[model samples]
Target: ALLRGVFVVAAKRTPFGAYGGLLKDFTATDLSEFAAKAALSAGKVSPETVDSVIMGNVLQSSSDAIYLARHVGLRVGIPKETPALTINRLCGSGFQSIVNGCQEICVKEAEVVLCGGTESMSQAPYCVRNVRFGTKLGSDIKLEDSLWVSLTDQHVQLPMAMTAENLAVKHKISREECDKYALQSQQRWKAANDAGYFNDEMAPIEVKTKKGKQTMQVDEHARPQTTLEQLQKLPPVFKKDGTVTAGNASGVADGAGAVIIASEDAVKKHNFTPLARIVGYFVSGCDPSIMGIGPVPAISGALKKAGLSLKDMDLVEVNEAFAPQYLAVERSLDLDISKTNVNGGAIALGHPLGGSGSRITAHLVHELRRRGGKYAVGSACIGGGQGIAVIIQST
Candidate 1:
């Protein structure tokens, strides 16, 4: 093993907020700060002990160019002496944050690291390119929807949902099949929330509205009430006859998640009750046109590195970017639906792009604890033809 053992002493996420909802007011820094503080507190550890900080984000929200990590770390009380880094690998940023933390510890650079991700899609800025240089006086001005444009694979000449549509057609996944999967995700999420499966995974966040201070939900906006009827009627988004609909895809959302990752000595030094152990991790690249299938290779590579097989997985989470894309991976890998995303997935829960990876990792840890499960895997497909997976085992 080139890397030493790494453990997550605590993991937490801010309740996901629907786009333009309760979390709209927060910068990515604000959410990351709250999550980081809560996770560190849960670990019974302090900022003074943290040697490094890493944060992941997709959209650069506001002046969060004091942008992400440095701003978040300072607010969360990481020492002025500490170094901070903010990274973007599109959707994989969050898991990559934790993986980087593990690397930092394994190489003896940082004993205690604060790793997390946050995104406030509501704050994703609209851009006016070439504005610094003047547009022609008679020319029409344009506003670029940064959020919309960024989700596209510019090189592949396809939008993210279009890629999903391509995979859906190629895999012969029908609209009904996608809807059925979407419905199951909604029901599973509702049932899981009803049973308080998420009680320990969230850190409460409060925002001041004109009405006064209000606490946010993990987004009751997660749209758990949908039935097959509601899902089936939605119009296709990317293609005229596309199977992909708004209902069957991950919703745009806002949220943040954080984990306290440490080496064996640091874990013992703090006398922490670790939530899980980092077994291994892997990432893979795929064709941009079928980016949704990204996780198929990544899952195999991750489990392979862990010296484990898919058969060893007692629990799993593959961030549901779109039902068709997810179905393609499911069919390709023969994944056990019974053990996968048992608490539902991004389809019902909302996909906060940079935030999804860490959110799922946090959820995976909590769910594994509740089920007394041994091995679990968390994976996500990135927007531009990539995927990442992290495997964890019960401590």
Candidate 2:
């Protein structure tokens, strides 16, 4: 509550690329640097003015081993003297990064701050846990996929899919309902893409290919042809008699997003146009087995912190990590479908883990501005049973 008013000066994200799709060759650092450069250019802010760079990441690519935030800063040409931090709150990491930046400004420790998240799920490596040690006969090598590891809970070992299944069963979310929600996400994304609603926020990236190089200027996974019939044919992924299906779940993705946050003083000092003001942020914990429903309390906490309520939010962007989770949260929170994820969500657009927070925030801000709305909320259910919500108001 002591935090000063933090303004979002500029924000941008690369088009979401499906796993092993157009962006497979691009490392997470490359995507992050591209977004960081675009954000600075958009805000017309000198890199020298950035006091810190905070980035959120889940999997550490080989190139990111030496501090991803610092790597991004150096690559983006920010002053070497600027400090950098990498945060991991699972799926909410990006939102936490922005919140961290705002806290720095609020404490008068920084002026301009760049914060965001990046992920290259396509590049997430498989590992042998015992490779460092000499192999022994009768000893298991324990080969593991990082993505799969991330999905498994340490305590109960319940995979994220099972968690969604738990929520669906608990909430009585039927297969048809989940399929319908998934279809809506696809249709909404198609309409938004066709209408060019994302033009201002998306930065075209050059994708390298075997033939040569090409520009990937659109979201790589949005299914315009997605329909209820197609979804109905798919079987459950986590359970035999379950409703959860790959068709209704978020696609693995590779992408990055960046947002420049500044104090009011920094805004005036840098002559930057404030797009929106960060009003409040809150993170709440829930049972890990039902992680998808974490957004309900998180949103309530955020609104309470901001001295506001659901009625005040002109737009709501709840990350659609899965259709069941989205539906459960919507029903539990009594959210108006009309106000939530108007352009679509992770189910149709792909979820690049750490990058989704800032990605959703950017969408909220841009859509809020486009509709001349006053208040918006960006919220996501984190892995490991946490949810983060941030409220923003148009300048």
Candidate 3:
């Protein structure tokens, strides 16, 4: 394989906010589409020149026929002729999308692509159907053997909370320790927000309500002022005696994100500054039944591919789906938590499902420039049984 012709010209994302948040009224398509359009507009690219849009979305049904990327392209006024595809790798959906896009260009399959993801946990659909049941005969007989209805799969059942509880118990991670980490995340996030680390990269999303609409410009759910005492008072979300509290895990959030990937010729023609080069990427599997702690093996796989180690990365962004899971990776890989998620992470910054991987990538790119770091890593723990890792080289 030769040195391919793809560069990430620009990227944008909506601020992470809780459900019923500033973006709650928007569908997943709307969130991601805005980002796609914003990135193109930011790059001043003509719609007719774009090849395709590729996006990752975890929560989807057959009815959501419009892949997030295509939907966003249309929403942002991209030409209808421009094709799009939606992909899902569970939790690492966004990262997978980018990897797929780069592979295509690297293999001479396409030239111009928009790659990223969008997710609205608030808007993700849910449908249910009857499952096998032993025999239950009702005398009325008119009643169905089982009643099925649609219900949102809360994070409690999504395995993140369960994994947190399990890891905390297995590792003897104290509740106080978890709460303290959560508080520190919040504090750092608030400082980052105040410092406007997100200004140029964020898209102003309109939050609609019965009251009206407001253009939300900042993260809406970060509780940076929270104290450990306050976190301790909250009741556990899973087992009554369990330790996985809301404060210790990522908040349910809504958002979309996107990046423009183009040939080197396109980069030069547009006079754009590449944020960072995608050096290498990989995804790995874990037992989704105990599905957290995915970062360890995922990063290991990517590092092995690149022939690099943790010591080689100048900065790292590990999705903090839960405190315990984050700790698990640190212990397993001997990674420094202090050097990870330095500006706060999902636990305090909010994790927006499909949008998270792209969001983390965007953050790492900017932080790499800020710190003048030569290399950075972005990784995430996916749902199901997987994780994703991507390496970025500053140029």
Candidate 4:
């Protein structure tokens, strides 16, 4: 079959880091800009050739980041006239951006496309503590308090551990099972980092703080010190007797990433070879209440559309948003956890929403090339009840 379009190039994120960690100095726009610039530079593409910039971001209303995707493009030197748009499919935004970008190129609307995602947990906007009300300010009022009931009722508030607690109860996954997986997650990711497999993609970030700016080299959340006993001792994040604890859940993070798409004609004209062609992509809605298990059905649909099967994939990138959710996908699909995320995953690396999907895609392709593999699959469970999947094949 003829290829419709391809993600010829993509670059993203230094490493996902702890909240208020390095790169905290940079806004989401800074990280996105740096990442987008890297994609263009790495791929050796001229910025002028780009037709549009499409990106995904979840924290839009917070911090006036409404046009985050577009800001990344402009900050990275794309002309202001180049149109850019931000998408928020929760965690699926990055994959959706690449999907949309591919569609645009296949239709011959433009030759070059930049796609990726970004988020700054440190800069994320919070609900205003107090507000002044007037009849004229009705438009400023919000239903956020009502809308967040699903998130808050289960004690899924501050720390992600709380949400994991809800997932643990609903799924009946054990605390021992999660802690065991958490330990391995760190070991595996540390091995991947030490092996230098991530050099091809994960970028370095400099974080700004009130004290000063400092460069961070790797993900900070992973804990080799974690022990099952130690983990079990930490207080639960939500309920007083909940199973979910800090050891089994992801933390708020800050990061940015980028992807470049091109037409077959453009690739030929520039004499640039793509890493892989976009086989297909899909995003599916799931019950928001049990949102943690979103990837099972999502990947099924994506593989069906690509006309391929899960066994066909040599590599897979499924962000470990929470141990319960991560394990649920594994048990549901019967996927060998070791075969997926060979270089570690969001569980150890951190899950920066909007950033993780693109980051995973970049790592998947990069690792495929390193290991001489032919195909890889990338998938993620998004916030607000969404799951996304993408397929790629070596060029």
Candidate 5:
């Protein structure tokens, strides 16, 4: 075991906004600072005391994103000398941030680390290469959409959902099954929101609009009235005969989440109460043709790291990248349906790719506290065939 024991003392996430909807006005760093600020304040941790910052982001949504982590840390009031790093592991970047922070503390490189992720796909820009050198007159012009380009594997030449479709077919996951899962996702999210289960974990964002200044504190993608009939009617997105559909796939969204994790000495020095302790985290690779299956190996490896089994987890947050994908992992692991995504999933909440890992972890930590769970797992499958899982124990 590492000499240092890591504990997450604070976590906060902004309400997820539908693609180009509620949070289009904010950039990745803007939302990151807000979430990080809220977490530090909520945890009673002073920004000045943070030893380092790690932020994850994807798609390079904003031009200023080159300075993503540094800008976020400075804006959040972390001390000037603290180091910052911007990392990307596609869908697993957020989880990577947390895991990296834990490692930093374990190695005695840092004590109080701020880790999180942010994504504003709405701001994903179009690119015209060689423009910096000037384009030739009447030459063929092409503009690549950064968001869509990143969703496909350059090696496979197939879109992300195509991978989901592959998993569905190989695993015999039916269209009806996927639709049913999607319906439950919507219902559960609505039910949880209605019960105010998300209030504490969400940090309200002040996004300006035509009307005036507005505070949005609720997820925008959930459809309380959505049902199986509606989901089944949607057309398959990857292939005409495929079971994966837009209705069952994760919604494109934008938001951010920031978490504060510290070593035992740091926690005691700050007198902070931990929301959860980092038990273990693991990332694994899988076949690119069925990228969704990545989580299956990832979860097992994570459990093995902590010397625990599936039975030890009282709660689990499996990012709903695609219903078929989610079902594949659940079936492969034989995860308890009753213990997973109890408040719905990304199908209903939206997946701000980079922000999702942290978002789910924050949700897991808070839900563990509310439900009196001893241990929880947050996991996600990455593009280009990788999966990551982080296990935490409620304190």
Candidate 6:
């Protein structure tokens, strides 16, 4: 069957902030609302035009819970009758949300859909559970990282960082190579940031600080001064002999990104100027222990689905979940590093879990437009042994 044409009318993202940075006071819902409002305003689309709101979030913080999507819809002025959905596919949740939105348009179930993801790692809380209501004697208060819990595989019980180490060993990617690539990411992002390349895509976010309220307009974790020397100085995080390090891996962060997708009729009716058209996408799974390699099959699947090849992509945005894993994927797929992540990636931009998926897609669209390129790919590795790839062409 022929695929339906899904047009991306507009996209926007909040400044990616480091953990406990300027966005610490904001929750996932707040971040989503910011991006949603900005997306609609930038696209010149009214909230009433949207038929559905789909949000991707890894952690909903107890306060928001199941109502997270609804909160974003209402706050963004989407009609009360608009149905909202919350998707949780870990790191790929944001991209999955966009896929769902596109599917809605394809099926003729919706004309316009608002989709994206948000994550606030700084606010992820510690949990305490009581087996029995009144018994405190045998109960222990264990301090755990919410990020760690999400990264930990339930069946294999392996942390996500360890998977990067496994990919390093499997692919024989050296520490020097990983560090070198990590340094390149930072350098490229720094160069792009200095040239104001991101101004058009990044939406300014207002955050509450201890002193007062202020606006955060740039990524907080981008180390412009980082070099191979500095990266090599950092010790391995997952294993003593591992190549993966804090410098070569993505930082835990808080942010949000939103994209508006519409059917052809909707685009015509709303007088929208589409940024890109989604051509094809695919999601694939792999062994949980070495989840970093998941992109191999995912990108291949998407290319096959689109009846295209890697050479067809003018640019690629493969999320830098970690340098070792990224290098492994490059080697496994035989991709040119120059064409991949042409500006930078999550390594320098910060990976805000669920927010990173759509964030990278938004970056790809804007960069492709800047270069006047026709085709691009956006992909990311999921937390639990999965990867997602979406192919888009500039409109």
The per-residue C-alpha lDDT of model 1 at residue 110 equals 92
Per-model root-mean-square deviation over C-alphas: 1.3, 1.2, 4.2, 3.9, 1.3, 1.5
What's model 5's lDDT at 192?
A: 93
* Pairs that collide, model 6: none
Clashes of each: 1, 0, 3, 6, 0, 0
Please report how far candidate 1 places residue 83 from its true position, in Å: 0.6
Residue 165, candidate 3: alpha-carbon lDDT:
73
Residues 226-323 of candidate 3 have per-residue lDDT tens digits of: 98889999888776777778888888787778877777876687676787778788888887655677777889888888788899998888888888
lDDT accuracy of residue 105 in candidate 2: 91
lDDT of each: 0.87, 0.89, 0.76, 0.74, 0.91, 0.88
Question: Which tens-of-lDDT digit does each residue in 65-111 have in candidate 2?
Answer: 55788889998889999999988999998899998987889889998
lDDT comparison, 1 vs 5, better candidate: 5
Report the C-alpha displacement of residue 224, candidate 3, in angstroms: 2.4
Which stretches of candidate 3 lie above 4 Å from their native place? 1-5, 61-67, 126-158, 209-213
| Best by the lDDT measure | 5
TM-score of each: 0.97, 0.98, 0.88, 0.88, 0.97, 0.97
The worst-scoring run of ten residues by lDDT in candidate 1 lies at: 216-225
Tens digits of per-residue lDDT, candidate 5, 1-395, equal: 44579999999999999998989978999989989999998899999879989998988888798999999999988888999999999999989999899899999999999999899989999998777887789988779888888889988887899999888988899999999999999999999998988987899988777899889998998888897888878888779878888889999999899999999999888898899999999999998888888889998999987899999999988899999999998898998999998999899989998999999999998999999989999999999999999999999
The model with the greater TM-score, 1 or 4, is 1
lDDT of 6: 0.88
Q: RMSD in angstroms, candidate 3? A: 4.2
**Whole-model lDDT for model 5 versus the true structure?**
0.91
- State candidate 6's TM-score: 0.97
Pitting candidate 4 against candidate 6, the one with the higher TM-score is 6
Looking at model 4, report the run of 10 residues with the lowest lDDT sum: 146-155
